[PDB]
Design an enzyme around this catalytic site. Structure first.
Site, PDB file in Angstrom:
ATOM      1  N   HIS A 273      60.526  29.686  12.712  1.00  0.00           N
ATOM      2  CA  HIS A 273      59.232  30.024  13.308  1.00  0.00           C
ATOM      3  C   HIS A 273      58.497  28.819  13.897  1.00  0.00           C
ATOM      4  O   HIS A 273      57.503  28.973  14.595  1.00  0.00           O
ATOM      5  CB  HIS A 273      58.336  30.760  12.310  1.00  0.00           C
ATOM      6  CG  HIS A 273      57.988  29.952  11.100  1.00  0.00           C
ATOM      7  ND1 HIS A 273      58.665  30.074   9.907  1.00  0.00           N
ATOM      8  CD2 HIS A 273      57.039  29.008  10.899  1.00  0.00           C
ATOM      9  CE1 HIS A 273      58.151  29.239   9.023  1.00  0.00           C
ATOM     10  NE2 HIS A 273      57.165  28.575   9.601  1.00  0.00           N
TER      11      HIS A 273
ATOM     12  N   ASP B  43      64.947  32.344   8.100  1.00  0.00           N
ATOM     13  CA  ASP B  43      63.928  31.460   8.652  1.00  0.00           C
ATOM     14  C   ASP B  43      64.329  29.994   8.573  1.00  0.00           C
ATOM     15  O   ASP B  43      63.717  29.204   7.849  1.00  0.00           O
ATOM     16  CB  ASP B  43      62.609  31.670   7.915  1.00  0.00           C
ATOM     17  CG  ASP B  43      61.433  31.161   8.688  1.00  0.00           C
ATOM     18  OD1 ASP B  43      61.649  30.561   9.764  1.00  0.00           O
ATOM     19  OD2 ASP B  43      60.297  31.369   8.221  1.00  0.00           O
TER      20      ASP B  43
ATOM     21  N   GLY C  87      51.439  23.395   8.749  1.00  0.00           N
ATOM     22  CA  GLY C  87      51.942  22.120   9.212  1.00  0.00           C
ATOM     23  C   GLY C  87      53.044  21.563   8.334  1.00  0.00           C
ATOM     24  O   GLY C  87      53.640  20.539   8.666  1.00  0.00           O
TER      25      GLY C  87
ATOM     26  N   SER D  49      55.615  23.534   7.299  1.00  0.00           N
ATOM     27  CA  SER D  49      56.807  24.318   7.554  1.00  0.00           C
ATOM     28  C   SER D  49      57.963  23.422   7.969  1.00  0.00           C
ATOM     29  O   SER D  49      57.782  22.452   8.710  1.00  0.00           O
ATOM     30  CB  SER D  49      56.548  25.397   8.600  1.00  0.00           C
ATOM     31  OG  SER D  49      56.027  26.562   7.982  1.00  0.00           O
ATOM     32  N   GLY D  50      59.150  23.755   7.466  1.00  0.00           N
ATOM     33  CA  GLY D  50      60.360  23.005   7.748  1.00  0.00           C
ATOM     34  C   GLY D  50      60.550  21.884   6.758  1.00  0.00           C
ATOM     35  O   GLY D  50      61.598  21.258   6.703  1.00  0.00           O
TER      36      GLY D  50
END
Lengths: 54, 241
Positions: B41, B90, B192, B194-195
């Site tokens: 995403h 995801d 912020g 994410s990942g």
């Protein structure tokens, strides 16, 4: 207009993607932080995409 | 990262920053000389690969770091399962334009094999430059933040999410996911992050257990963060090594 009355919805995902929403009380197209999913309709890629719709 | 603390410079060499048009949007985790794990995403189809950059060896996001390589992206492969879900799969692999050189400040984390299980309540660390609270920015010069969070089984995590669940806002933890956090909240990853890596120590050794994915809020009670399991995709990721 319509959904232009809903508050900005960040959603469950945790990215920092900047988007525009219409602040109907303010009469203004405002920036918010979108998370990357489950976006509502009061959520635009651009300021003018926003004012245009509402 | 909400409720964490500042990492020392060089303490999480596998942490990377992801910028679209020069703005940080996602964290990432480096896994080899030329590859990065992150979240699907963080990369909507509307964005242009050419406008994605990656910062490594970056401790304070808003500071010129001596040894902090920057790279463009040769490739971006979100998991095949993603563009038809918004419910599962995801994760994405980012291929750097050129392989980079490892230093004390830039180093990959090891991936867990497909048949790898981490005990519940195991304390792991998530790391990011995300908001330090609901829509409250991390303060410049944006020091990488870290946070120990215990792993929570997906059965228990679904119990939690059902508490005060809004019928219209369903949150389910799928088989490819895991939860980590505190039930009383206050500690969690935020926008912020994410990942970002969920790094779990197993015998003096750091494994990439999860990729920061989603959560109800951040610091919300009964809403610990959910991470994408690295092991659930080991098979796939190994298909490019």
């Amino acid at each position: 207009p319509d959904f232009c009355l809903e508050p900005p919805y960040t959603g469950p995902c945790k990215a920092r993607i900047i988007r525009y929403f219409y602040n109907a009380k303010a009469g203004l197209c405002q920036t918010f932080v979108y998370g990357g999913c489950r976006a509502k309709r009061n959520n635009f890629k651009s300021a003018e995409d926003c004012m245009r719709t509402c | 990262i909400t409720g964490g603390s500042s990492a020392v410079a060089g303490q999480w060499p596998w942490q990377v920053s992801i910028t679209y048009e020069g703005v940080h949007v996602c964290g990432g985790s480096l896994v080899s000389e030329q590859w990065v794990l992150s979240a699907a995403h963080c990369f909507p189809s509307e964005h242009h690969k050419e406008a994605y950059e990656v910062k490594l060896g970056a401790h304070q996001l808003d500071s010129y770091s001596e040894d902090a390589k920057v790279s463009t992206l040769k490739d971006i492969i979100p998991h095949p399962s993603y563009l038809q879900e918004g419910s599962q799969g995801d994760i994405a692999l980012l291929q750097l334009s050129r392989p980079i050189t490892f230093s004390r400040y830039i180093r990959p984390i090891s991936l867990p094999a497909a048949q790898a299980s981490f005990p519940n309540g195991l304390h792991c660390t998530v790391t990011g430059w995300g908001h330090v609270a609901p829509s409250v920015s991390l303060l410049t010069p944006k020091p990488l933040q870290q946070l120990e969070v215990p792993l929570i089984s997906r059965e228990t995590c679904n119990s939690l999410y059902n508490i005060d669940a809004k019928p219209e806002e369903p949150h389910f933890v799928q088989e490819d996911m895991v939860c980590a956090g505190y039930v009383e909240g206050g500690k969690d990853a935020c926008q912020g992050d994410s990942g970002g890596p969920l790094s779990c120590p197993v015998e003096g050794l750091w494994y990439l257990t999860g990729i920061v994915s989603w959560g109800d809020a951040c610091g919300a009670r009964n809403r610990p963060g959910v991470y994408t399991l690295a092991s659930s995709y080991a098979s796939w990721i190994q298909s490019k090594v």
